[PDB]
């Protein structure tokens, strides 16, 4: 690796690369940063904490014209793997986390191609706020979001956009979360129905605010209610319906009110069971609670 | 050369489908620029160097559930005078495993750990298994699971777009059998007793 060592020395030592400055010719220019999200696996959705835990891989693409070289002059080298701390980065963070972990988990190497394109695919474990609608529990569906933006840079400095596919005769933006059919396997309790992606821009917010721009990836997920059905609803419903037998019990048995009050006690035990599984929110009474 | 030593099977989480294990990830490779002649240095044939000071493979657990993706414990490497480096960092792997609960508590699971260089393809960095099986010589006994079988396989994938760029991984799989005595004693026997008591009302 005489050639890679020489190329790195040329790019960074000789030309005096400064990672603190953005890759622009003038300060008034903005850096285009394209983002895509791959959902490796949906770890969980905790209802009481109202928290979604996901494993995601964030594909970043941008251009750094200071990292350009003519490959023939450097042994036909076309791509370099570099530590991310050597180059300028677009400081994309998860805005709507609820644990203080704003950043990606593993800071993997950047791939720098000879034409100045920087490709970076860090993976991350994120814990995000997802308010829960308990109205139709356990037959409920939820709507979670992952809002990515920059706090160190505003819309004046970087322009966020979705990944643009350009392999065909018409380009198009990737407006969905990427799910690899070979590397993905569904969560045991949640099935993904929709998975859109959007670039949100606040017209009222000023350009020099971090809240002007964001890219949001949404997950509409449906609960698979088999567990709750089998282990709660059928026993509870059957035990509740069992109370109607008292009208067919003769009064001489001396066991009517005992049966009825015991059914009430069983329902109380079921209510104790269910109280530990949902948040104590006031938007609605859960269907099982109803 | 990549080898996996399984020290302990810490826990199997059937709800979130996560296997947490304690492992040692032995990695061996030659560094061309880190050679010397021992005669010129008093017969020193090996030294210990911080792992942060040298290039390393960027091995990542591809099927990580919610733990660390790569090595975070940067222990020292053993460097020989021939440039050979052995680095055996510890790790706690939290890996996704599709749990089939059909036969629970008499179920058998097949949990895998897929490892690969995240940013290097097979044309720049090649990984090979150290052995056909994970090293279980220092495995602590589990009170909940019995590992019936273990085996490491190397896989190479070439995409039709890029025929000269293979992407490599090594997958270590463990076929494990649950020990059902706890569930037999605590769950099945009381349920059987209630089932038996159900019929006594008719006498």
């Amino acid at each position: 690796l005489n050639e890679e060592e020489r190329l790195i020395r040329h790019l960074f030592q000789e030309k005096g690369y400064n990672k603190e400055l953005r890759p622009v010719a003038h300060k008034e220019e903005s850096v285009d940063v394209a983002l895509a999200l791959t959902l490796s696996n949906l770890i969980s959705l905790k209802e009481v904490e109202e928290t979604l835990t996901t494993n995601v891989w964030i594909e970043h693409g941008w251009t750094d014209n200071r990292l350009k070289w003519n490959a023939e002059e450097f042994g036909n080298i076309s791509v370099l793997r570099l530590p991310p701390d050597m180059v300028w980065l677009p400081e994309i963070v998860l805005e709507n986390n609820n644990d203080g972990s704003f950043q990606i988990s593993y800071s993997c190497n950047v791939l720098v191609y000879h034409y100045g394109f920087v490709y970076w695919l860090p993976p991350a474990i994120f814990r995000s706020s997802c308010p829960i609608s308990v109205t139709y529990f356990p037959f409920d569906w939820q709507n979670c979001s992952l809002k990515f933006s920059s706090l160190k840079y505003t819309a004046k400095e970087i322009t966020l956009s979705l990944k643009q596919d350009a392999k065909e005769n018409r380009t198009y933006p990737v407006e969905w979360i990427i799910i690899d059919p070979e590397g993905f396997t569904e969560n045991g309790e949640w099935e993904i129905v929709h998975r859109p992606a959007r670039v949100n821009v606040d017209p009222r917010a000023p350009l020099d605010s971090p809240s002007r721009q964001d890219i949001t990836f949404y997950l509409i997920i449906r609960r698979k209610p088999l567990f709750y059905i089998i282990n709660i609803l059928v026993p509870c419903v059957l035990i509740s319906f069992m109370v109607n037998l008292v009208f067919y019990l003769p009064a001489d048995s001396g066991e009517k009110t005992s049966v009825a009050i015991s059914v009430l006690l069983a329902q109380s035990v079921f209510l104790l069971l269910i109280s530990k599984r949902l948040p104590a929110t006031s938007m609605a009474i859960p269907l099982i609670g109803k | 050369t990549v080898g996996l030593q399984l020290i302990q099977l810490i826990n199997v989480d059937e709800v979130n489908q996560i296997v947490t294990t304690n492992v040692r990830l032995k990695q061996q490779w030659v560094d061309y620029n880190l050679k010397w002649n021992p005669d010129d240095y008093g017969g020193v044939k090996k030294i210990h160097i911080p792992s942060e000071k040298i290039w390393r493979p960027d091995l990542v657990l591809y099927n990580n559930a919610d733990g660390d993706f790569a090595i975070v414990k940067f222990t020292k490497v053993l460097l020989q005078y021939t440039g050979h480096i052995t680095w055996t960092p510890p790790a706690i792997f939290k890996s996704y495993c599709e749990i089939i609960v059909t036969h629970f508590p008499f179920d058998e699971q097949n949990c895998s750990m897929k490892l690969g260089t995240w940013t290097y393809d097979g044309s720049v960095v090649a990984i090979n298994p150290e052995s056909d099986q994970p090293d279980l010589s220092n495995f602590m006994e589990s009170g909940e699971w019995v590992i019936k079988e273990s085996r490491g396989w190397k896989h190479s994938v070439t995409y039709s777009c890029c025929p000269d760029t293979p992407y490599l991984d090594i997958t270590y799989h463990f076929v494990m059998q649950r020990l059902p005595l706890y569930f037999i004693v605590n769950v099945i026997i009381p349920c059987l007793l209630f089932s038996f008591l159900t019929g006594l009302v008719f006498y």
Partner: antibody
Amino acid sequence: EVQLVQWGAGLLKPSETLSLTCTVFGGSLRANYWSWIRQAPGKGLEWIGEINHNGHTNYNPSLKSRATISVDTSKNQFSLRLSSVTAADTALYYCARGSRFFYYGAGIYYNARRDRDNYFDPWGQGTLVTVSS
Amino acid sequence: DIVMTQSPGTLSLSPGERATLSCRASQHVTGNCLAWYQQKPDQAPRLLIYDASTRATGVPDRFSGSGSRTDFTLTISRLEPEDFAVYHCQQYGDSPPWTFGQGTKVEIKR
């Protein structure tokens, strides 16, 4: 050494369709964008449109409705068709090589993009087009 | 979308003199993405400068590009007989459509 050779009928009548073809030697169409540029006598250069090897086109807004650019990779050629020509379309037409086009990634992350270097270093010899009745 | 205007129009200068050609953009040229071309009679345009300062291959040291933002300059230090041609500026920094200037002819002065 990339060379561009143009051909096509330069003498046309009003309301007809000009058709020009540019063939590339010493290189493939895969690596670049390829553009058509017209120069009227006593006027500046005007960019008509561009195409890449996948057939993705961009057009000048003033000529988009009448200009169609196509590519044929088997013969390493790209062609321009200008419909309903008038005397205002009399000009010297050039083909030229534009910005570099690159592929990156593997599997589902395989993608392509163009470099921000759309200057025209290699040009065709030029074809004089005259539209007269 | 971006209009390019070349100011001198015609430059009558003697051999051995210094020529200065100006190009003005109606909008900021991102990244200093400006190219200068030379066109002799009965010939296609030849790329002289790109990125507003970088000489193309085979271009003598007499040609030099400079400027930024919306004001760009091509300077010929010493004029030779072969340098009397039509010079064009072009912008490529802000997506298509790609636009040229109207051209500036450099004539010989007698």
